């Protein structure tokens, strides 16, 4: 007439602050560009959306 | 102490008074139904980022 009781549960590890993966959702994207233009014998650079 | 009219069998003995604390491994039996806490200690050697 002897008995034994057992229990357990699940938790989260501490290393989740360095090793993890992330799941994202995407939408419409923007664009940008950079150019070189030769103007009266000189090189100039421009940057714009 | 001496007990009269008894065999070596049919008797049980144990040591029951302690003055230190010990970690509660799953390989040792519990003291009572609800355990009493006495302290805590920390785990060394954390993680970090590096190059290889
Ligand atoms: C560097 O480690 C920190 C936590 O210590 C973490 O937040 C970060 O994402 C890590 N960066 C890289 C590049 O591993
Ligand atoms: C700058 O202009 C000169 C002409 O003046 C041209 O020869 C040269 O290729 C230009 N620079 C670059 C990086 O193309």
From Swiss-Prot, chain A:
<comment type="subunit">
    <text>Interacts with spike glycoprotein E2. The precursor of protein E3/E2 and E1 form a heterodimer shortly after synthesis. Processing of the precursor of protein E3/E2 into E2 and E3 results in a heterodimer of the spike glycoproteins E2 and E1. Spike at virion surface are constituted of three E2-E1 heterodimers. After target cell attachment and endocytosis, E1 change conformation to form homotrimers. Interacts with 6K protein. Interacts with host MXRA8; this interaction mediates virus entry. The interaction involves 2 adjacent E2-E1 heterodimers.</text>
</comment>
<comment type="function">
    <text>Class II viral fusion protein. Fusion activity is inactive as long as E1 is bound to E2 in mature virion. After virus attachment to target cell via host MXRA8 and endocytosis, acidification of the endosome induce dissociation of E1/E2 heterodimer and concomitant trimerization of the E1 subunits. This E1 trimer is fusion active, and promotes release of viral nucleocapsid in cytoplasm after endosome and viral membrane fusion. Efficient fusion requires the presence of cholesterol and sphingolipid in the target membrane.</text>
</comment>
<protein>
    <recommendedName>
        <fullName>Spike glycoprotein E1</fullName>
    </recommendedName>
</protein>
<feature type="glycosylation site" description="N-linked (GlcNAc...) asparagine; by host">
    <location>
        <position position="43"/>
    </location>
</feature>
């Amino acid at each position: 007439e002897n008995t034994q009781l057992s229990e357990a549960h699940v938790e989260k590890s501490e290393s989740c602050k360095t090793e993890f993966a992330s799941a994202y959702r995407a939408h419409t994207a923007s664009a940008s560009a950079k150019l070189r233009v030769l103007y009266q014998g000189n090189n100039i650079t421009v940057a714009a959306y | 102490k001496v007990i009269n009219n008894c065999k070596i069998d049919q008797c049980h003995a144990a040591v029951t008074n302690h003055k230190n604390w010990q970690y509660n491994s799953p390989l040792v039996p519990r003291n009572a139904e609800l355990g009493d806490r006495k302290g805590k200690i920390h785990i060394p050697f954390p993680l970090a980022n590096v190059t290889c």
